[PDB]
Write a protein that binds this ligand. Structure first.
Ligand code: HEM
Length: 82
């Protein structure tokens, strides 16, 4: 099932490669995706250990990309956080 994770859990996943971020409470495991992503690694890693809902939704991307994104959900905001 979804691995319920607090901001903390993501905040801990932020290293040179080790990259997690949040896109509407849902935690996206982009550590692999860095190298796949047409928008590169740097950006995602910079957003790492935080809610990048902002950056995804503000960049806007594409329906397809919005829907591709789901494949990287590992977790979601702790029921106290959420
Ligand atoms: C987790 C969801 C993500 C997925 C699956 C994803 C997917 C993609 C895809 C498919 C593109 C190509 C353009 C398009 O068709 O939309 C793209 C471009 C891009 N992405 Fe992402 N992305 C994700 C998250 C992010 C985040 C959080 C950032 C910001 C740190 C970001 C920054 C960019 C940038 C700057 C581009 C380049 C736009 C251009 O072509 O000028 N993406 N992404």
């Amino acid at each position: 099932a979804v691995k319920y994770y607090t901001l903390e859990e993501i905040q801990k996943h932020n290293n040179s490669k080790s990259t997690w971020l949040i896109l509407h409470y849902k935690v996206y495991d982009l550590t692999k995706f860095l190298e796949e992503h047409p928008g590169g690694e740097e950006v995602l890693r910079e957003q790492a250990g935080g809610d990048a809902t902002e950056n995804f939704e503000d960049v806007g991307h594409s329906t397809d990309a919005r829907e591709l994104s789901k494949t990287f959900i590992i977790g979601e905001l702790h029921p106290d956080d959420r």
